[PDB]
UniProtKB/Swiss-Prot annotation, chain B:
It comes from Sus scrofa. This is Insulin B chain. It comes from the Eukaryota.
Length: 21, 30
């Protein structure tokens, strides 16, 4: 999930936008 | 800003700024 992709590992804009509505 | 380790309120803040008026969903356990 988001914690695995952005918190435990380095986040990216590409990934963040996957969570916008 | 976006390209770093973002956790907790720091992650929530990033989603808020990036998604803007679109809003977002935060699911820690998924």
């Amino acid at each position: 999930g988001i914690v695995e992709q952005c918190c435990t590992s380095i986040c990216s804009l590409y990934q963040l936008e996957n969570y916008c509505n | 800003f976006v390209n770093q380790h973002l956790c907790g309120s720091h992650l929530v803040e990033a989603l808020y700024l990036v998604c803007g008026e679109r809003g977002f969903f935060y699911t820690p356990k998924a």
